[PDB]
Amino acid sequence: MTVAYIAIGSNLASPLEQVNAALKALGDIPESHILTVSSFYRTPPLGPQDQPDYLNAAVALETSLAPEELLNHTQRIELQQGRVRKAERWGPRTLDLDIMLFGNEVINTERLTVPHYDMKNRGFMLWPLFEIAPELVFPDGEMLRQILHTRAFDKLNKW
Ligand SMILES: Nc1ncnc2c1ncn2[C@@H]1O[C@H](COP(=O)(O)CP(=O)(O)OP(=O)(O)O)[C@@H](O)[C@H]1O
Ligand SMILES: Nc1nc2[nH]c(SCc3ccccc3F)nc2c(=O)[nH]1
Ligand SMILES: [Ca+2]
Ligand SMILES: [Ca+2]
Ligand SMILES: [Ca+2]
Ligand SMILES: [Ca+2]
Ligand SMILES: [Cl-]
Ligand SMILES: [Cl-]
Ligand code: NA
């Protein structure tokens, strides 16, 4: 088994409802168990700002799935919760499940890049991750605690 860390975002169609439904669906992924769920955070949108605030969270998921098999399930859950692709880049969504980390693995396949390419710059990913995994070390040896100590990220507020 490995521990994967999944970021959750939602800013459409009742985010609290979407995220609670997603937690139930994440539990039902085969070969996998949720170990830890963060608090829920209400975060202002980054990138396009003409959209509702997000509910952001993180989950630790122990799994024996292959990384792309986990992606299959997270994409299925998003689609089953009504995620619709629109042409605008980084538009609002009912549910977004990003695989932040998959153990200490560095994955670069056609469908999957892990670590998530921008997570070290996003407080809405890092703060919920630190809540559930304060001792985390990245594949490149960087410590989560050191990033959060050193870099300016705006304060997050709970939902
Ligand atoms: N670590 C990862 N987690 C989830 N999907 C990933 C991924 N690495 C690559 N992908 C790919 O990312 C594709 C596009 O996903 P989107 O959800 O539209 C990007 P987004 O989450 O809106 O922006 P972001 O990646 O800047 O956070 C997916 O279809 C999937 O194949
Ligand atoms: N708060 C919040 N803002 C978001 N913007 C996006 S689109 C990626 C993106 C694009 C540009 C800058 C930062 C980014 F993150 N996703 C979320 C989310 O989950 N939470
Ligand atoms: Ca399971
Ligand atoms: Ca827009
Ligand atoms: Ca995302
Ligand atoms: Ca995504
Ligand atoms: Cl959507
Ligand atoms: Cl890394
Ligand atoms: Na580095």
UniProtKB/Swiss-Prot annotation:
UniProt superkingdom: Bacteria
UniProt xrefs under Pfam families: HPPK
Presence of keyword Membrane: no
GO biological process: folic acid biosynthetic process; tetrahydrofolate biosynthetic process
InterPro entries attached to this UniProt entry: Hppk (IPR000550), Hppk_sf (IPR035907)
Enzyme Commission no: 2.7.6.3
Gene3D superfamilies: 7,8-Dihydro-6-hydroxymethylpterin-pyrophosphokinase HPPK (3.30.70.560)
Catalytic reaction(s) noted: 6-hydroxymethyl-7,8-dihydropterin + ATP = (7,8-dihydropterin-6-yl)methyl diphosphate + AMP + H(+)
Family annotation (PROSITE patterns): HPPK
Residues that span the membrane, as ranges: none
Catalytic temperature dependence: Thermostable. Retains 75% of its activity after heating 30 minutes at 96 degrees Celsius.
Function: Catalyzes the transfer of pyrophosphate from adenosine triphosphate (ATP) to 6-hydroxymethyl-7,8-dihydropterin, an enzymatic step in folate biosynthesis pathway.
Family: Belongs to the HPPK family.
Subunit structure: Monomer.
Entry protein name: 2-amino-4-hydroxy-6-hydroxymethyldihydropteridine pyrophosphokinase
Organism: Escherichia coli (strain K12)
Gene transcribed to yield this protein: folK
